[PDB]
């Protein structure tokens, strides 16, 4: 469908709050969706690359952990 809107305003505000943000421009929310999307495209492309190299039709968490390590964004706790 068209799911990027499903990253709602309030959910963006929540993340920003955890990030210590007090006041938030009206323009931030679309700007953040762009960044989040860019972030996902890159991580997933490498994940999928790993999946395809393994001749599988199902992305594993390792595919994603390995992709994340490739982006200098190591993740612990999903078999890493």
């Amino acid at each position: 469908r068209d799911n990027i809107q499903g990253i709602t305003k309030p959910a963006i505000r929540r993340l920003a709050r955890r990030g210590g943000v007090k006041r938030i421009s009206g323009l931030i929310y679309e700007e953040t969706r762009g960044v989040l999307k860019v972030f996902l495209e890159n991580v997933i492309r490498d994940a999928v690359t790993y999946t395809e190299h393994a001749k599988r039709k199902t992305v594993t968490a390792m595919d994603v952990v390995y992709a994340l390590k490739r982006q200098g964004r190591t993740l612990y706790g999903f078999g890493g």
Partner: protein, 105 residues
């Protein structure tokens, strides 16, 4: 027969570590002292995180370590925070830290 771990006075599996080294494409050959040295280092580091992660639990009035407890422990220690600066601990959350200028007067 007693394990190489027991000879070295360790909890971590010196035999396992030595095999991982042989099977991980690091060198053609592996010294006997290497896996002993390594195992010990991994155990030390492990002990240093568990000491600090236990303290965060006890301070939360909890018996069992969770991801938060590890995170708190790690980021509140300058050295560990450096070691794991580019590492994300899932279900860790962040240290409470509100910038002073954002606070009321």
């Amino acid at each position: 027969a007693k394990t190489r771990s027991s000879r070295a006075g360790l909890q971590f599996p010196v035999g396992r570590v030595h095999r991982l080294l042989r099977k991980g494409n690091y060198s053609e050959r592996v010294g006997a002292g290497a896996p002993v040295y390594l195992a010990a280092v991994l155990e030390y580091l492990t002990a240093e995180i568990l000491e600090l992660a236990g303290n965060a639990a006890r301070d939360n009035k909890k018996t069992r370590i969770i991801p938060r407890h590890l995170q708190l422990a790690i980021r509140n220690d300058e050295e560990l925070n450096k070691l794991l600066g580019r590492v994300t601990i899932a279900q860790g959350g962040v240290l409470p830290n509100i910038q002073a200028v954002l606070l009321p007067k």
